[PDB]
Amino acid sequence: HSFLSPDAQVLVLAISSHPLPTLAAFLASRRDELLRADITSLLKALELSGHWEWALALLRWAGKEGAADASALEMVVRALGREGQHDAVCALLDETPLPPGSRLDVRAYTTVLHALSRAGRYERALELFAELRRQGVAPTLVTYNVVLDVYGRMGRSWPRIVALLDEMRAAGVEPDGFTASTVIAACSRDGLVDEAVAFFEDLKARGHAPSVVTYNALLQVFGKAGNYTEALRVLGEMEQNGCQPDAVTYNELAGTYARAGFFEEAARCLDTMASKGLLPNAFTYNTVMTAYGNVGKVDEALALFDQMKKTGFVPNVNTYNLVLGMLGKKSRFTVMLEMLGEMSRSGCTPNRVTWNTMLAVSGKRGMEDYVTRVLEGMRSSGVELSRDTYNTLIAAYGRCGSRTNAFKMYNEMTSAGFTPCITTYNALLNVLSRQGDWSTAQSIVSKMRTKGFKPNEQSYSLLLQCYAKGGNVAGIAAIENEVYGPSWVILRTLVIANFKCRRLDGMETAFQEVKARGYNPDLVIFNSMLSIYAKNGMYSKATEVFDSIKRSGLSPDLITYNSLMDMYAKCSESWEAEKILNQLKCSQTMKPDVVSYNTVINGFCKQGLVKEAQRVLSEMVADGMAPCAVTYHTLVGGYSSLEMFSEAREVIGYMVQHGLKPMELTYRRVVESYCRAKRFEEARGFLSEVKALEAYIEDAQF
């Protein structure tokens, strides 16, 4: 409009006021008039008026005639580039092959390249770049920079970057601020620490002057690496060479350590800020608290929170929701409530995220008490319960077994009129699984079914769990049958439920069914199968299952080896249990616990080999394991069983000379064995060294 001759101005206006889908026609309606235009000016005008899609349309049309040429293509490529239209550019260029490089100008392509880079479309970025290369186009600084960025984001492309810089230097293209920053960040992304440091050094030796940008980038590399010392040196260099670390610099550092997982570092940083009169953010405080959080460190999170509050900072809903979720992870019930108490009084009010956060706990004792308290709170201040808040509620109640409460909220939800969906129903099905109440559960599935829903594989899992806890083998068998006429969450549940009922057939079958879809039996399953094969006496089968575990790749745990040792103990083969114990002893990655020792000890008594059981007890004490009184009574009664009264006493004297004190039953047991062996004088003697017992003896003799 400001550079077109008047006639051409009417042409452009007439084109740009034509609807797109049929522009072709009208264009053809002025072919004679068009092949005379400077088509490049026309495209330009369309770009400057917003009609890029029209520009593309015109170029595409002019291409099928003579009218297309190099300056036109570059005008549109530059246009769509600046317009951020990478899809359409890529399409355009796939339909074409660029003119000789002589009539190319790299500068027209930068924006497109950049637009591709920012869209994560890296392979296209590099195809465009490759295409330019094929035409002998010499890249310029900016072109280099963008390509470098593509490589950096891509990852694991260090050799190519170094090659790229080599080529940059050979062409006498001197790196600028962006070059350095980009290369260094390309390094931080991967953890190319020594490579970044090397590059920085080169950059310095070649007498280039690093700016805030490159320092800040270097800081990012060491920040993500958790390289403390080197980061402090970078800060020192910033100080010496003009820049001079900020509150911003330290905040980003601490923050970057913390987000990378290095909290101890981050906290060291906050320490330094604190000593230097530097003001931490809120976001950084929170970030270090999430570091301590994730890792598990809660107390130190909360210590940091108190610190945050001491310095007058007033935390908001999101910060409190953050700490709350952190505590939810653990299950800290009481301090959760203390914090919620703190928010109200504090001054901000919980939103739906807070509620959903506190009610997204599970765990042990105290949860229904907790959830009740949270209900009290939620009503103790506005908070309209949405149809979704009910599900959070019923699910929380259902997660302990508070059936009464779960159904209470369910009615409260039905009263206030609501269309309780499926998660509600599974929440109920979930509460029913403690009391093995398949009856009410079935009923629930009926209601679900008719009101036209369709039971989740979760529903079916919960029902299975219900029949199991309720001894109802029938319903489990029936569901099985339905299943073989089909998930994994269901199959696994079947192995487990049949196991809880000692029903081997269904265990065998559902295992067979999991292994059929060449799946991945999971350790729990395997431990189960070995367990059942042990209890029914099929020992070569459970050996076969162990072999099955070790075969694939999975490696057994304590529950496994303890299952084994126990089976072997049951078979009077308490030597094989011992061999396994010893294996564990020198496993390097596993140690045995009290159960494995008690299995070997109890087994060696049972098989009569009490001497050995004593040696294993001695070892158990040697590796710093502490036996209960019943185990001592077990080996004492073992010795007694065989008239070995001297060693029985030895055990007891060892018990006393340690502040243990043996069960009354133990003295009794020795006395009983004495009295059956007809060694009454002896028993009396035993009582002399060590009154009801005496009375007993006297009764036994006369």
Q: Does 142 bind a copy of itself (CB under 8 A)?
A: yes
Kindly tell me which residue out of 38, 593, 623, 681 binds a copy of itself, with binding defined by CB under 8 A.
623
Question: What is the closest distance, in whole angstroms, from the C-beta atom of residue 11 to a copy of itself in the complex?
Answer: 18
* Preceding-residue numbers of gaps in the chain (C–N over 2.5 Å): 485, 690
Q: Does 140 bind a copy of itself (CB under 8 A)?
A: yes
Question: What is the closest distance, in whole angstroms, from the C-beta atom of residue 477 to a copy of itself in the complex?
Answer: 22
- Residue 286 one-letter amino acid: N
Kindly identify the residues of this chain, within the stretch 70-109, that bind a copy of itself according to CB under 8 A: 82, 107
Determine contact, residues 469/457, Cβ cutoff 8 Å.
Answer: no
Question: What is the closest distance, in whole angstroms, from the C-beta atom of residue 661 to a copy of itself in the complex?
Answer: 4
Q: Does 338 bind a copy of itself (CB under 8 A)?
A: no
Q: Does 587 bind a copy of itself (CB under 8 A)?
A: yes
Nearest-angstrom CA–CA distance, 509 and 513: 6
Kindly identify the residues of this chain, within the stretch 388-417, that bind a copy of itself according to CB under 8 A: 388, 391-392
Token pair belonging to 541: 């089968």
Question: What is the closest distance, in whole angstroms, from the C-beta atom of residue 29 to a copy of itself in the complex?
Answer: 29
Kindly tell me which residue out of 5, 487, 572, 618 binds a copy of itself, with binding defined by CB under 8 A.
487
In the chain the first and final C-alpha atoms are separated, in Å, by: 131
Cβ-based neighbour number of residue 171 at 10 Å: 12
Among the listed ranges 61-69, 268-276, 462-470, 516-524, the one in contact with a copy of itself (CB under 8 A) is 516-524
Cβ-based neighbour number of residue 694 at 10 Å: 13
Q: Does 453 bind a copy of itself (CB under 8 A)?
A: yes
Nearest-angstrom CA–CA distance, 699 and 201: 97
In the bound state with a copy of itself, the residue whose beta carbon lies nearer, of 40 and 392, is: 392
Kindly identify the residues of this chain, within the stretch 262-301, that bind a copy of itself according to CB under 8 A: 264, 282-283, 286, 295-297
Among the listed ranges 88-96, 419-427, 528-536, 683-691, the one in contact with a copy of itself (CB under 8 A) is 419-427
Kindly tell me which residue out of 40, 71, 85, 157 binds a copy of itself, with binding defined by CB under 8 A.
157
CA distance to 277, 611, 630, per residue, from 622 (Å): 55, 17, 19
Q: Does 178 bind a copy of itself (CB under 8 A)?
A: yes
Q: Does 355 bind a copy of itself (CB under 8 A)?
A: yes
Among the listed ranges 59-67, 461-469, 522-530, 620-628, the one in contact with a copy of itself (CB under 8 A) is 620-628
* Residue whose structure tokens are 């596993």: 590
Kindly identify the residues of this chain, within the stretch 179-198, that bind a copy of itself according to CB under 8 A: 181
268 burial (CB, 10 Å; 0-12 / 13-18 / 19+) is middle
Name 84's Cβ contacts closer than 8 Å, sequence gap at least 6: 111, 115
Q: Does 368 bind a copy of itself (CB under 8 A)?
A: no
Half-sphere exposure for 392 (CA within 13 Å, toward CB): 20
Kindly identify the residues of this chain, within the stretch 423-442, that bind a copy of itself according to CB under 8 A: 423-424
Nearest-angstrom CA–CA distance, 79 and 386: 50
Kindly tell me which residue out of 13, 70, 421, 523 binds a copy of itself, with binding defined by CB under 8 A.
421
Q: Does 509 bind a copy of itself (CB under 8 A)?
A: no
Kindly tell me which residue out of 7, 345, 659, 695 binds a copy of itself, with binding defined by CB under 8 A.
659
Token pair belonging to 46: 């369309």
Kindly identify the residues of this chain, within the stretch 303-322, that bind a copy of itself according to CB under 8 A: 315-316, 318-319, 321-322
In the bound state with a copy of itself, the residue whose beta carbon lies nearer, of 538 and 675, is: 675
Name 265's Cβ contacts closer than 8 Å, sequence gap at least 6: 226, 228, 257
User: How many residues in the shown chain lie near a copy of itself by CB under 8 A?
Assistant: 101
> How many whole angstroms from its chain centre is CA 514?
26
Q: Looking at residue 95, what DSSP letter applies?
A: S
Name 214's Cβ contacts closer than 8 Å, sequence gap at least 6: 177, 180, 181, 184, 200, 203
Q: Does 447 bind a copy of itself (CB under 8 A)?
A: no
Could you write out the three-class secondary structure of 588-655?
CCCCCCHHHHHHHHHHHHHCCCHHHHHHHHHHHHHCCCCCCHHHHHHHHHHHHHCCCHHHHHHHHHHH
Mask for 668-687, x = binds a copy of itself (CB under 8 A):
x-------xx----------
Q: Does 456 bind a copy of itself (CB under 8 A)?
A: yes
598 burial (CB, 10 Å; 0-12 / 13-18 / 19+) is buried
Kindly identify the residues of this chain, within the stretch 556-585, that bind a copy of itself according to CB under 8 A: none
